[PDB]
Ligand binder design. Structure first.
Ligand SMILES: Cc1cc2nc3c(=O)[nH]c(=O)nc-3n(C[C@H](O)[C@H](O)[C@H](O)COP(=O)(O)O)c2cc1C
Ligand SMILES: Cc1cc2nc3c(=O)[nH]c(=O)nc-3n(C[C@H](O)[C@H](O)[C@H](O)COP(=O)(O)O)c2cc1C
Ligand SMILES: [Cl-]
Ligand SMILES: [Mg+2]
Ligand SMILES: [Mg+2]
Lengths: 221, 225
């Protein structure tokens, strides 16, 4: 698979945490729809797809976010596209929530017979397997983990088509939460902010990428 | 160059459609050593918050150890025995990824090559980030789950990369934490409390094709502002 592998690893080395984008270079509609598709097609635990990708293009709303997003001071103004990745809350992804039943039926096409058992399994899984019901936050964080699959996928896919990105956690939750809630974007408590991601074209190449040695992050048994 | 661009997108989306949660692999078909090294590299090269790389990829090839895990991994009953390669993705614990931990200092100095003024500032930023920005110090588990989120980036990447080279996978959360934790602890895999289990992933070759993939319509998971 030598050619494919090289192309992919070149994209992994292309992708970096871009701090500033070219404000005059926009990702095409087609390319951005492809990036979003890699998010949409991502896998998720129990197939629940507990995410929403909010594409904030409005400059004024970006600036509202920027006040409380220390990690995106240049990324927010300059990005071609800027995404808030939301995750479902306990309201919607506790085992007995209506969202789960509707998703399994309407999206996953899971028969009613089958979903009864699947939701019973989900219940035991959340309570006793992974202890996800420890708190409402524990359960949100579980949903949020699924969103990080989508995050990783979207950034990598972007890089493979020559589009830079930057994942962003550097924000003040309390303030971002309020802003999104008041804007309506959390859908009556269905969602909360998980992670942000900018997309666009770099202005300068970065310094060489650094990572742990393979022997320090891989072990064979 | 436009056709090539379009073909890159097509081939990637084909891989996204190829990848599925494979329930059973072919026990007679192994991923090559070279192919699996590539898959691991996509994990290693993944980004992480604060660059901390708070993961370990444990490749469990030993069939007896797989079987020990199987007892307590309801979500991998056929995947454990049949997979070509099986990975336990571990995440760093509070011991190592709280702002004031030695792991962070060493990582910033030796991997990230920061001079001390820069790492001191970075660690100060990390402290405020954990305490007050994202409230990660609510509990040891809050902090662990933050490290675990980073590992899900690597999980996603590895599975997608595998699919791009025709290798099936299955992500796995369906396990009893208490028992898996003990099994890995007793084997020495958690490195004296440095790590805990985050998520599992199997790799190999399918034995049958899945049913069509289902996902939410794009208009229901994307909103423009
Ligand atoms: C983090 C995670 C954990 C999962 N755990 C299991 C599991 O234990 N066993 C399993 O068979 N499938 C597992 N799944 C697979 C999901 O059910 C599957 O990804 C989802 O329904 C979407 O289907 P697809 O991956 O075939 O596209 C898991 C998925 C993810 C992302
Ligand atoms: C979830 C996540 C959150 C991050 N938050 C920020 C951020 O707020 N601002 C920033 O400039 N970089 C941010 N980073 C980028 C990391 O510092 C960077 O990914 C890491 O040092 C590895 O470098 P690379 O991505 O350039 O390969 C974040 C990374 C991840 C994965
Ligand atoms: Cl366009
Ligand atoms: Mg246009
Ligand atoms: Mg062609």
């Amino acid at each position: 698979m030598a050619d494919v592998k090289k192309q992919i690893l070149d994209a992994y080395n292309f992708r970096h945490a871009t701090k500033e984008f070219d404000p005059n270079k926009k990702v095409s509609d087609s390319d951005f729809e492809f990036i979003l598709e890699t998010g949409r097609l991502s896998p998720s635990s129990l197939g629940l797809e507990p995410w929403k990708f909010v594409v904030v293009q409005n400059p004024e709303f970006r600036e509202k976010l920027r006040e409380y997003t220390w990690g995106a001071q240049k990324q927010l103004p300059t990005a071609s596209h800027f995404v808030l990745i939301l995750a479902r809350t306990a309201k919607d992804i506790k085992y007995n929530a209506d969202y789960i039943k509707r998703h399994l039926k309407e999206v996953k096409q899971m028969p009613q017979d089958v979903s009864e058992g699947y939701i019973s399994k989900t219940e035991e899984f959340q309570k006793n397997d992974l202890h996800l019901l420890e708190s409402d936050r524990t359960l949100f964080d579980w949903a949020s983990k699924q969103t990080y699959i989508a995050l990783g996928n979207m950034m990598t896919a972007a890089a493979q088509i020559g589009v830079d990105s930057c994942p962003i956690e550097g924000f003040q939750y309390d303030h971002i939460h309020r802003i999104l809630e008041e804007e309506g974007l959390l859908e009556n408590g269905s969602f909360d902010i998980s992670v942000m991601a900018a997309f666009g074209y770099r202005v300068r190449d970065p310094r060489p990428k650094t990572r742990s040695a393979v022997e320090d992050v891989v072990k064979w048994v």
